[PDB]
RNA sequence: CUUGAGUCUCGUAGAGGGGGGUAGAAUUCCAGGUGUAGCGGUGAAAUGCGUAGAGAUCUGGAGGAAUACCGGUGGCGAAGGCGGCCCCCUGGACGAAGACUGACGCUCAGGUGCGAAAGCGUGGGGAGCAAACAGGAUUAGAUACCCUGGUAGUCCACGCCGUAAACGAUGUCGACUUGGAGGUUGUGCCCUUGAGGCGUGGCUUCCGGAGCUAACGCGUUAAGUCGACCGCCUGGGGAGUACGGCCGCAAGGUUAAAACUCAAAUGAAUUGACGGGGGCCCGCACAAGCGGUGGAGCAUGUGGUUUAAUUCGAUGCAACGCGA
């Protein structure tokens, strides 16, 4: 409610050691079976070699670029009815949010297996594909697209 | 209300005339009139202006 | 294809809607805009940032001439008395004089009772 | 006789009244130019208006109503009420040197007259607004609130009706009784050297002392202390009704009961509860997410239904894997 502290410092990736990738595995994690999450994403994250052939590291961030929004809505119980006054999105959630769309939509892909069903999505991310990239504009069509209230 | 300035710029000067008429004596009309509602509320809002 | 060069621009700023017409010097229609005609309708218009996109549409119909300068006629209150003039200042047009031509009587006609909820 | 009351003089302020003019802003409408697919409206919408060209815009014209700013806690009036500028006829209030009359005064049943708005009659007028009425919407319904229209009416003359929370809910006249701040208007005075400063009258706001008051509150403009005259009240309902009279064109007004019925009706103030009142707060209350229930098969309980019995209980959050 009124509580005001700090964020929960997360433990970096099991290898590259990166908070950005840390909360990534967590957002992807399920049933506290964190192990699988690693062995499911950490693989597809490197399986990019077969998909490219080099130091697959920045590919992740570059892939998220096509999935990084900067405007969202927010209904407000004002003016009798309910406003929508859209507002941008700070970095703290930008990177986070995206990760959800990248995973929460990579599951309904319906491919070989979550391990790979995820990999492909990354390539589709930077190359614009799947609901992951969709959600962006499908969301932007509200904010910045309806500044009439913003 | 009459604006006019040299050196093209969209400064303003406009809200200067916005202190004598403007959206005020406008909304004043807008809806119905007043009659007894004013002479009263005009003499009660006056009480407010005391402290 | 007349090339009026310069002509005042009326900004009928209202509540339920706003419309700006870039008429000529004498007062002839050269190009008018409209919020209702600016995609969004219903009531989503009104808002200033919604009228600006309307009047700006004139620079697409009244641009056939070559208005190098123009005045502004703001009439009636509502979200479109400022927005309009602004969008016009960016559209590339000039300016010669801003003025409010809102009909402010002297207690003439008796306004409608209306509203009572 | 002169201090009450009044007359005269000379000034002052005023939306006091009656008549006649006149000005500017805006609305609507008529005509024409430009220009083009929307306008208008609402919470949304829809009716409605638009390609027979609206809306917008500009030019010219017609007409009616009301007078932004000044405008105020302001002013004038017996009350009701009275706002643009100009003229004509007219009433009252106040101050000051004074001069004059000489108690000629106060109140006032009955009586006469004036009375918001709505309404009525005859004849005018009619822009805007708007009972009625008609559409559209809302809703369970919506003979409403909202929206699009709109007739009487609102305006004028002349006559009628006399009511209002016609309220300060506080009759008129007079004399007394601590104070403070302010408004408006007259007058005397002060290096009048000033915006100005000191008094002395009229009217008027707000606070408040004594006192008064059931309390709220009133408090030199009293609801305080007194005096003169008048109107009025005597529990609530029935009822400002019936009947009769009087008045009215008619609405209806005025005067004004009983039967029967209840044990109260009522006034202010206190405590709290509540408010689709306000201010400030906290709770996984919401918002942010993670996973569910609602569908599915099975378990369990319950209401049903059934049964000879389906033992009793638990039933809004606090009942149902509860007493078991
Ligand atoms: Mg109506
Ligand atoms: Mg008086
Ligand atoms: Mg009348
Ligand atoms: Mg009549
Ligand atoms: Mg007092
Ligand atoms: Mg009470
Ligand atoms: Mg907690
Ligand atoms: Mg939630
Ligand atoms: Mg969910």
Swiss-Prot record, chain A:
Keywords, comma-separated and alphabetical: Ribonucleoprotein, Ribosomal protein, RNA-binding, rRNA-binding, tRNA-binding
GO terms of molecular function: mRNA binding; rRNA binding; structural constituent of ribosome; tRNA binding
Resulting phenotype, residue 34 to A/E: Defective in ribosome assembly
Record-annotated disulphide pairs: none
Highest taxon listed in the record's lineage: Bacteria
GO cellular component: cytoplasm; cytosol; cytosolic small ribosomal subunit; membrane; ribosome
Keyword Transmembrane helix: no
GO biological process, one term: ribosomal small subunit assembly
Role description: One of the primary rRNA binding proteins, it binds directly to 16S rRNA where it nucleates assembly of the head domain of the 30S subunit. Is located at the subunit interface close to the decoding center, where it has been shown to contact mRNA. Has been shown to contact tRNA in both the P and E sites; it probably blocks exit of the E site tRNA.
Family: Belongs to the universal ribosomal protein uS7 family.
Assembly behavior: Part of the 30S ribosomal subunit. Contacts proteins S9 and S11. Cross-links to IF3 and the P and E site tRNAs.
Extra facts: The strain K12 sequence is shown. Has been predicted to contact the N-terminal domain of IF-3 based on footprint studies; exactly how IF-3 interacts with the 30S subunit is controversial.
Protein's UniProt name: Small ribosomal subunit protein uS7
Native source organism of the sequence: Escherichia coli (strain K12)
Gene: rpsG
From Swiss-Prot, chain B:
Basic residues compositional bias, start-end: 43-51
Keyword entries, A-Z: Ribonucleoprotein, Ribosomal protein, RNA-binding, rRNA-binding
GO molecular function: rRNA binding; structural constituent of ribosome
GO terms under cellular component: cytoplasm; cytosol; cytosolic small ribosomal subunit
Coiled-coil segments: none
UniProt keyword annotation of Ribosomal protein present: yes
GO biological process terms, semicolon-separated: cytoplasmic translation; ribosomal small subunit assembly
Oligomer status and interactors: Part of the 30S ribosomal subunit. In stalled ribosomes contacts ribosome rescue factor SmrB.
Function: Probbly involved in recognition of ribosome rescue factor SmrB in stalled/collided disomes; fusion of protein fragments to its N-terminus decreases ribosome rescue in the presence of SmrB.
Family: Belongs to the bacterial ribosomal protein bS21 family.
Name of the protein: Small ribosomal subunit protein bS21
Shown segment, full-protein numbering: 4 to 54 of 71
UniProtKB/Swiss-Prot annotation, chain C:
Protein family: Belongs to the universal ribosomal protein uS11 family.
Primary role: Located on the platform of the 30S subunit, it bridges several disparate RNA helices of the 16S rRNA. Forms part of the Shine-Dalgarno cleft in the 70S ribosome.
Gene3D superfamilies from the UniProt entry: Ribosomal protein S11
Descriptive protein name: Small ribosomal subunit protein uS11
Gene Ontology biological process terms in this record: cytoplasmic translation; translation
GO annotation, cellular component aspect: cytoplasm; cytosol; cytosolic small ribosomal subunit
PANTHER family hit by this protein: 40S RIBOSOMAL PROTEIN S14/30S RIBOSOMAL PROTEIN S11
Domain of life: Bacteria
Record text on subunit structure and interactions: Part of the 30S ribosomal subunit. Interacts with proteins uS7 and bS18. Cross-links to IF-3. In stalled ribosomes contacts ribosome rescue factor SmrB.
HAMAP family in the cross-refs: Ribosomal_uS11
UniProt KW Zinc keyword: no
UniProt miscellaneous comment: Has been predicted to contact the N-terminal domain of IF-3 based on footprint studies; exactly how IF-3 interacts with the 30S subunit is controversial.
Source organism (scientific name): Escherichia coli (strain K12)
Gene Ontology molecular function, alphabetical: small ribosomal subunit rRNA binding; structural constituent of ribosome
UniProtKB keywords: Methylation, Ribonucleoprotein, Ribosomal protein, RNA-binding, rRNA-binding
């Amino acid at each position: 409610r009124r509580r005001v502290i700090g964020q929960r410092k997360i433990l970096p990736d099991p290898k590259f050691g990166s908070e950005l990738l840390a909360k990534f595995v967590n957002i992807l994690m399920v049933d506290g079976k964190k192990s699988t999450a690693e062995s499911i994403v950490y693989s597809a994250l490197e399986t990019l070699a077969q998909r490219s052939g080099k130091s697959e590291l920045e590919a992740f961030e570059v892939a998220l670029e096509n999935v990084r929004p900067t405007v969202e809505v927010k209904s407000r119980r004002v003016g009798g009815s309910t406003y929508q006054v859209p507002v941008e999105v700070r970095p703290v959630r930008r990177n986070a949010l995206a990760m959800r769309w990248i995973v929460e939509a990579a599951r309904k892909r319906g491919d070989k297996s979550m391990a790979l069903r995820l990999a492909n999505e990354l390539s589709d991310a930077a190359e614009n594909k799947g609901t992951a990239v969709k959600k962006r504009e499908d969301v932007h069509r509200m904010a910045e697209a309806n500044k009439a209230f913003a | 209300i009459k604006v006019r300035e040299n050196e093209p710029f969209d400064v303003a000067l406009r809200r200067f005339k916005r202190s004598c008429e403007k959206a005020g004596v406008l909304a004043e009309v807008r809806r119905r009139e007043f009659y007894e509602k004013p002479t009263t509320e005009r003499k009660r809002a006056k009480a407010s202006a005391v402290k | 294809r007349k090339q009026v060069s310069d002509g005042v621009a009326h900004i009928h700023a209202s509540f339920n809607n706003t419309i700006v017409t870039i008429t000529d010097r004498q007062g002839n229609a050269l190009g008018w805009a409209t919020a209702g005609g600016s995609g969004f309708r219903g009531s989503r218009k009104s808002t200033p940032f919604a009228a600006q996109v309307a009047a700006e549409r004139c620079a697409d119909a009244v641009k056939e001439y070559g208005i190098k300068n123009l005045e502004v006629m703001v009439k009636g209150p509502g979200p479109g008395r400022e927005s309009t003039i602004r969008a016009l200042n960016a559209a590339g047009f000039r300016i010669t004089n801003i003025t409010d031509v809102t009909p402010i009587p002297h207690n003439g006609c008796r306004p409608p009772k209306k509203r009572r909820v």
